[PDB]
């Protein structure tokens, strides 16, 4: 099946990896 | 009793021990058809006799060890024994 | 009051050892 | 530093828990 | 099963476990794993036979 | 910047290294086109380039433009290296094949599996590329 | 056929000197005593805590009382930055005269042993100023710890021995241990801190004597009831506080200001009497959250097997099967002795991370050989906590554990795909090491050959960022909290940042240890120690899963957890067991933590000393690691003692030597091994009973070799002595023969 | 003998670096990790390191890379003697290159 | 001493008895396999825990097993 709520909070994760990236990058400020 | 001939060497440093007197002491017996040069469990080299031999020995392990030397002399009649310090001897090779 | 040290360094050094040691080999070898 | 008396006040109250440690270290068995 | 059949095994004690065997010969009666099982790779002590019960093996042939 | 980056072409102390050159090879000028290299590194407070695995594409050069390079071979060197474990399983030996090398069914696999990304997704997408765990051997729990 | 030991007949009845040495190693398991019950063992190991826990005031009583009756103390407060702290005293009848007189130091009339464990420091601070509170306090302990003595002795009598059901009553632990042991404790030295040591630390005597008469505040508790609590916090110690003065002293008792102490550039005692304060009422509030005998709270066996989220249907919380934990947890010793060392093994290494970056003790970050054991101290104590939570884990997977109860949940689950976490595990330990090696040889290859400008060096641009992001100007990143504009500067709908402009002073100046500048050398450590990390723990974890079993030897939990072999059938089977995979860490957790230590060891003697720049050049190749840390800094230590005199350090320089021997003697009971002592203990029982004198005499029990379990204990134990000596005389007296 | 002899005269071996003896300081440092590498083979056994290929296998089975000879780890006698050689190696070639750089510069 | 289990696998080999050396194991009749005879440990106060007993075996796993035990002086080897 496709794994809802192992993706699910894989993703939720992954976009915490980027927005810090965001900062560091100064795409966000 | 046992009766066997004790082999031809000139003593060891191995031999027996504090044990025979103390604890137990083992005893192995084979009738061999000539006289020949075997090895000691204890060390070196010795020579058995013709006929019943005897060989006091210090553990169980020996004999069975010795036995498997034995084999190779077409020797397959070694009977180990159980003599302890009060004077039992039990036969304990074979079972039967 | 420091001359407890002269009397109780060697005590422990010498003394403790030796009443601790003859005490536990007639203990461990006590049928 | 300290006063020659009170080094033995502190070695008679040291009994205290030296009585009880030989009545704990053997209530635990031998 | 037959001499020749590639059977899998589920005990998991045994080293071929979850492996793909093959079916040397079966006995009749006796002993309660009458299954020579000719493996192809082989063990720690070296060899690749063992004895399997009936029940034991998945046939995929 | 970066950071404690100023660049190597800025530095007094890149300069001061670049006035007493060592030449790598026997060419006698290796010294000097060593640094004129280096100058658009940073280098920081003692004047040796520092590198910067950010994935800044003005330090590209750093990391980005090996990684790649890297990753292109050293799958490949793993990728023939399967290609030919799964052809000799299908053999009569099976072990002399590992030890001594079949070089007539090597030699095509060695030289076919350049595009092996585009092969290794088709393993992947029809799932070849992985095996069932109710056929793996496994320890008892 | 003695009666030793008691606890076995099958070791009573060995005729060898194995009988001696397996008593002590199985003393105090007491879960494999003879006719050990259930019962009978909680109430055995409830009792011992109590002695274990008595030891510990007592040992903290000798700290008192041989300072105040042997140090000086009362010297030491009228200057902490000079006066050189005293430990001990030195009774030795071996000396000879030039070394009575070199270590007659520290103003003392004998030999004294200058104290290098910082008690001086934590006294100093919590307001303990002569020789008497010193006594006072070492007296109190004597009485405190014999409550603890004669209360074991108290819960083993019949009727006032507790039940099994006392024990296994764990949500009622939680709640008095939470409010009680950690909350009120964290209540109570906030109440210590407020009306005594921040009063001391002003110039102003309060003792037992007046301190129900003097309030800590002149407002005095009528703003805590009204609301006003903002009284509290108003005119503070000003910048120019002269420390235990009068001089530029406040009035405020619970404050905020972040940062440090500009004199003893420790943090402000009102920041830590408002912080154990808001602790305490974390922590009681905390404690009224399970459920005991009042019908209310939260029930954590109903927490666990809980399957509804909702009127949703789930497999328990987060989805994922914890049920049968809680009679996992709870029945199980080892499964819990194993999780708290995990927990205490963490927490240990934390508190030696926040310690020399985060100064809290008076005049500790200018005294130096005080600020660098407590690192390395309180690291090596973090080491054994951890190694020893994955062996106390592994004994449960062998003994406790049963895998009907844990059936189909999240711990059956890992031992599933328990190959797929130690392949992956393998492969971070060779593709760390692989990489981190590598770079060290080229770096070492490339300065070898004179041209060191080819070197691979990467700022950590990823920790860069992190200190920037805690307000860093130095590096130019400008963000968060290095940014003036950012919303997590200012705190935008409430702006309460009060921390901040006192955090901002002590985090960029270059005077302290808070938010070391990094550079390339410092990235090549980290990825070194997260080599020993990822490999440690590899070693650990594949011990614990393969505990019960594999495929070269099936039914490992037949045999134990500590047995030699299996023979050496099936290729050889030497180091198998779950014990062995204890074994092999243990040289990894103290090779890991030599590289965290001799990593912090030499950033420190580049700031301590003002040269900065001889490990930011130097410690990116391996030969300045060499060099320049173990062959420049040894040269205080080991003329210690030459042909000319000796001075102060000859005990280090003689620690030092004893320490390379006593590591090196272990290695003769690992390379050689056991099969070879026997063969020649067996020609020494010969020559006794053949000499002709010496014969009268003869042994009780038969001298057998070492067994094959035994002296990879002892081989482990000669080289982790040895190995913690060395380094410790190492570090001690390069740092206090520099300063 | 340990100030005198090998603190003071591996002055030489150490500081030959951006020289001609640069090779001595490299065969100095990388024979003290020969000898360090030996023991891994010299403390440990054997029945450890079989259990962890068994977990590598595993992988190696999983994306068909299995191989047909299969690995098995050293013996009980070979492990022994890889751990010796390795340990001879690298405790000689410590004083091959201490020896050199302290009598090729003070003789 | 030690303790010698056989179990049910075993199919009369009788590796394993001619290569313990204190005879501690000895063949006894037994309708099950196809050589009609199992190993039995009648005298295994006299094992040693030498192991050749497992070594020899051929079935996997192993019929035979040694679980070491309590260490009297027959099981040490001690000649004294
Ligand atoms: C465990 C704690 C501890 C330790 C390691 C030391 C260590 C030392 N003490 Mg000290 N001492 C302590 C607590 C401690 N003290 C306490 C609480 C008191 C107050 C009674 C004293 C009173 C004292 C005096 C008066 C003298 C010393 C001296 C000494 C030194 C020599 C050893 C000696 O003669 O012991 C002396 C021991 C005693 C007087 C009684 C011991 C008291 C403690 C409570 C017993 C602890 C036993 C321990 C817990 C048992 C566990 C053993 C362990 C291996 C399992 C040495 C520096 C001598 C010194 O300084 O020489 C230069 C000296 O003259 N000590
Ligand atoms: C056919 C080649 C091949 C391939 C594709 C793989 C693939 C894999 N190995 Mg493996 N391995 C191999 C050979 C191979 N291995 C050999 C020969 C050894 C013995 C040295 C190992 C030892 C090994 C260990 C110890 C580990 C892996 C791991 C892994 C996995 C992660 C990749 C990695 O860490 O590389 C690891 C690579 C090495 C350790 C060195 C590579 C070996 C040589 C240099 C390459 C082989 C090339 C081959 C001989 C060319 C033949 C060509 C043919 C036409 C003749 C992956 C499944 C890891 C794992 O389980 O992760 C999940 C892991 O921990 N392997
Ligand atoms: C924190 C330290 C600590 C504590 C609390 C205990 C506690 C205990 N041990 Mg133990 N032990 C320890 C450390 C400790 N041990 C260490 C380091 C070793 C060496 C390896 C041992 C070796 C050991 C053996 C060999 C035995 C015990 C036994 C015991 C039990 C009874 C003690 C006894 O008879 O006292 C003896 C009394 C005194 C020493 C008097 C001290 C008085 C002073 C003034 C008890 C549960 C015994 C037992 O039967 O357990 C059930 C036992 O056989 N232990
Ligand atoms: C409010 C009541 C209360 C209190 C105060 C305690 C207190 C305690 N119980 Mg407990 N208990 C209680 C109720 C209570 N219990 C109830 C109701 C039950 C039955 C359900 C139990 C059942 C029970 C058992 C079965 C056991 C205990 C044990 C303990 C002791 C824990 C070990 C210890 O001293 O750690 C002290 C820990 C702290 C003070 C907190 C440390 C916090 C972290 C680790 C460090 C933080 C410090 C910080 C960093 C600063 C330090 C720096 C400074 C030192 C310089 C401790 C004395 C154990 C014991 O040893 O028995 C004697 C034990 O075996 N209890
Ligand atoms: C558990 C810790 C603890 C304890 C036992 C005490 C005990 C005491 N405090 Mg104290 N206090 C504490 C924590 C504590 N305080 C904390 C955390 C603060 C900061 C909010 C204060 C702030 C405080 C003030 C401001 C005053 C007291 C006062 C008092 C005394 C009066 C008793 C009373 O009214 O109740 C008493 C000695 C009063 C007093 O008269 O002291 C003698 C007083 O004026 N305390
Ligand atoms: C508070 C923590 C704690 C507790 C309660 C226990 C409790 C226990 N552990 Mg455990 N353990 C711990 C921490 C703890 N451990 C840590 C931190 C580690 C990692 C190092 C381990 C590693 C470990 C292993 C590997 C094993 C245990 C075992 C045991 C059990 C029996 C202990 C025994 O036989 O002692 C006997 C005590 C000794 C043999 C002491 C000898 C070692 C001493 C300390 C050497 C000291 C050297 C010397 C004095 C230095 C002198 C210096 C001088 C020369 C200058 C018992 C349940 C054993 C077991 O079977 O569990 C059921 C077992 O196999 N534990
Ligand atoms: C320039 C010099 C240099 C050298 C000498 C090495 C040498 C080595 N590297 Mg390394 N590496 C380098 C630069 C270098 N590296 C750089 C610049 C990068 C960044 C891209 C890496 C990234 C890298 C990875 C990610 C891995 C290695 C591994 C290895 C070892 C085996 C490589 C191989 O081909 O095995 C033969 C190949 C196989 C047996 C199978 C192929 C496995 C390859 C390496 C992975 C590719 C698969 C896939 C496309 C990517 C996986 C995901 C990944 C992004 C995490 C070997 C010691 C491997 C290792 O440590 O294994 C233990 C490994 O996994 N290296
Ligand atoms: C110079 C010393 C040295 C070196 C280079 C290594 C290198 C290695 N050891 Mg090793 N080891 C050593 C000493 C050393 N060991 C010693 C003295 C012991 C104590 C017996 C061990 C015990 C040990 C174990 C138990 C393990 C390693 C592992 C590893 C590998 C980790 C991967 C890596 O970083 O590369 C690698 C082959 C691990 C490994 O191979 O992972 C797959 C592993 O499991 N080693
Ligand atoms: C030396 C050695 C022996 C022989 C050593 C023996 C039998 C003991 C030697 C020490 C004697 C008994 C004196 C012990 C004195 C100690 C220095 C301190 C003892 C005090 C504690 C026990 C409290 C082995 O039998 C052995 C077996 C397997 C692997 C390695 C070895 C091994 O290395
Ligand atoms: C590492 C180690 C192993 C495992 C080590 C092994 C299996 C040796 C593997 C090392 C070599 C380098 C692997 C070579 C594999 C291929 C033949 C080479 C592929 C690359 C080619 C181009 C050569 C043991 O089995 C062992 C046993 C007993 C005591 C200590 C140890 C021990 O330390
Ligand atoms: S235990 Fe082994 S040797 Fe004995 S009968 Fe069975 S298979 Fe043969
Ligand atoms: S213990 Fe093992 S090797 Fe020794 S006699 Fe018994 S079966 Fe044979």
Known sequence: PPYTFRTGWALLLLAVNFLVAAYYFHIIQ | TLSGKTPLFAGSTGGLLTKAVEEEKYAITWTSPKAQVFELPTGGAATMHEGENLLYIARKEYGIALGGQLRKFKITNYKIYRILPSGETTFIHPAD | ASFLSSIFVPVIGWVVPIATFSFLFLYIERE | SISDTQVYIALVVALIPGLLAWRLATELYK | VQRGSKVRILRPESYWFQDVGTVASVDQSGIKYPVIVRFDKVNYAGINTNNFAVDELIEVE | LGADLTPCAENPAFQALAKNARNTTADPQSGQKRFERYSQALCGPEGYPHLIVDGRLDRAGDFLIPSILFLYIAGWIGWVGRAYLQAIKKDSDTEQKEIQLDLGIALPIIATGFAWPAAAVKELLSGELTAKDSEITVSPR | ATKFPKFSQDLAQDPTTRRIWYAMAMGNDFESHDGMTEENLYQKIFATHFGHLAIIFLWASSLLFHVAWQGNFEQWIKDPLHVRPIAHAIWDPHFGKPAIEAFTQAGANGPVNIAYSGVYHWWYTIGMRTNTELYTGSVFLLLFASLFLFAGWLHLQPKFRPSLAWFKSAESRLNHHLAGLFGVSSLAWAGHLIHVAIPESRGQHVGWDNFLSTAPHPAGLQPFFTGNWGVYAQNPDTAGHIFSTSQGAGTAILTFLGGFHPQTESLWLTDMAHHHLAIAVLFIVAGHMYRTNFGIGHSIKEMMNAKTFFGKPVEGPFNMPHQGIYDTYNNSLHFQLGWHLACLGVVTSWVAQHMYSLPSYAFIAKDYTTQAALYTHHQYIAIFLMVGAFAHGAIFLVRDYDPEQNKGNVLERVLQHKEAIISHLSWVSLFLGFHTLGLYVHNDVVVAFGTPEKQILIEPVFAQFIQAAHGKVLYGLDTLLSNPDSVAYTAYPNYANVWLPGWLDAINSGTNSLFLTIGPGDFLVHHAIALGLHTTTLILVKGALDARGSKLMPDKKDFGYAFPCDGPGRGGTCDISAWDSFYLSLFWALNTVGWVTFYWHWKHLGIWQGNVAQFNENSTYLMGWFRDYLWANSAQLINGYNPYGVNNLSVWAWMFLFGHLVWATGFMFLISWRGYWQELIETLVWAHERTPIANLVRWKDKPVALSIVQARVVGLAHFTVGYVLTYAAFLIASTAGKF | ?107 | SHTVKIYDTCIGCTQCVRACPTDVLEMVPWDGCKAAQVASSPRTEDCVGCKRCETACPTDFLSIRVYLGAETTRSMGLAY
């Open chain 8, 1 to 107: 003998w340990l100030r005198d002899f090998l603190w003071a005269q591996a002055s030489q071996v150490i500081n030959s670096y951006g020289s001609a003896l640069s090779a001595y300081g490299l065969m100095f440092l990388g024979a003290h990790f020969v000898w360090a590498f030996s023991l891994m083979f010299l403390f440990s056994g054997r029945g450890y390191w079989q259990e962890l290929i068994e977990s590598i296998v595993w992988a190696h089975n999983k994306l068909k890379v299995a191989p047909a000879i299969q690995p098995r780890a050293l013996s009980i006698t070979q492990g022994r003697a890889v751990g010796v050689a390795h340990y001879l190696l690298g405790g000689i070639a410590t004083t091959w290159a201490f020896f050199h750089a302290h009598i090729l510069s003070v003789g």
